[PDB]
Design a protein around this ligand. Structure first.
Ligand SMILES: O=C(O)c1ncsc1NS(=O)(=O)c1ccccc1
Ligand SMILES: O=C(O)c1ncsc1NS(=O)(=O)c1ccccc1
Ligand SMILES: [Zn+2]
Ligand SMILES: [Zn+2]
Length: 232
């Protein structure tokens, strides 16, 4: 029942209730002739919603807000982007125009600026050193260290034991490294072990792309990263 590219037209978004007051959002983008899904998170914050990551671009993100509006019917007041790439900040300007307060670390804002990407308005302090965690409403934000990108954050919903790994965590189906241009391969496994150490109780692990699972996604990702590191 988890939505795949199958159930999702180009320019459309599906929501998936993972737990009470926690959903993933699923969108698709065409890239180099293939079609790849992407996940973000939606977390109920009393009578409002906290959004984790855009739906990979302005059109998808306007569909996401319409689909939230239609299916949950609570306002999105804040959004956090988990790193600087376009599947995470692309659509920020849409969210901003809808009155959503957009947030990212200074590290992510700096990198999004160097990249010419959209730049979330608000700064998330206290995440600059590996292993930093800060509370953000119904979630904890964690900086595990450099992995998929130097700035990548992970998100934990303590009430539902939902860990959103973002692009630092691969789905089981992904058996080779994806985009690693901005990755720190030497630190990625160490950063994953920081996630392991910090959230050993997590019950649902949502990767940046694809199928949810459990904490076996962290080891899976370690395996894939090391295999890549050892390419000859
Ligand atoms: O900080 C903000 O921009 C903001 N957004 C929605 S309510 C509020 N304050
Ligand atoms: O890993 C990711 O988080 C990722 N996010 C968007 S795309 C991609 N991975 S990707 O398909 O392998 C790629 C991107 C850009 C250029 C080539 C390949
Ligand atoms: Zn990325
Ligand atoms: Zn990605």
């Amino acid at each position: 029942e988890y939505p795949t590219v199958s159930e999702i037209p180009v320019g459309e978004v599906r929501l998936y209730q993972i737990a009470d007051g926690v959903w993933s959002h699923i969108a698709t983008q065409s890239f180099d002739g293939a079609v790849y899904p992407s996940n973000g998170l939606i977390v109920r914050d009393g009578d409002e919603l906290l959004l984790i990551d855009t739906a990979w671009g302005a059109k998808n993100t306007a569909a996401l807000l319409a689909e939230i509006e239609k299916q949950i019917g609570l306002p999105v007041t804040r959004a956090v982007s988990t790193h600087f790439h376009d599947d995470r900040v692309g659509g920020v300007d849409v969210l901003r125009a809808a009155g959503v307060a957009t947030y990212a670390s200074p590290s992510t804002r700096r990198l999004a600026e160097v990249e010419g990407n959209e730049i979330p308005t608000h700064s998330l302090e206290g995440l600059s050193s590996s292993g930093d965690a800060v509370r953000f409403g119904p979630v904890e934000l964690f900086y595990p260290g450099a992995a998929h990108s130097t700035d990548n954050l992970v998100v934990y919903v303590p009430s539902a034991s939902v860990l959103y790994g973002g692009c630092a965590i691969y789905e089981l189906s992904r058996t080779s490294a994806g985009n690693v241009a901005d990755a720190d391969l030497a630190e990625w496994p160490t950063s994953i072990e920081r996630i392991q150490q910090h959230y050993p109780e997590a019950q649902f692990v949502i990767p940046g792309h694809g199928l949810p699972g459990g904490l076996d996604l962290l080891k899976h990702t370690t395996n894939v990263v090391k295999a890549h590191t050892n390419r000859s």
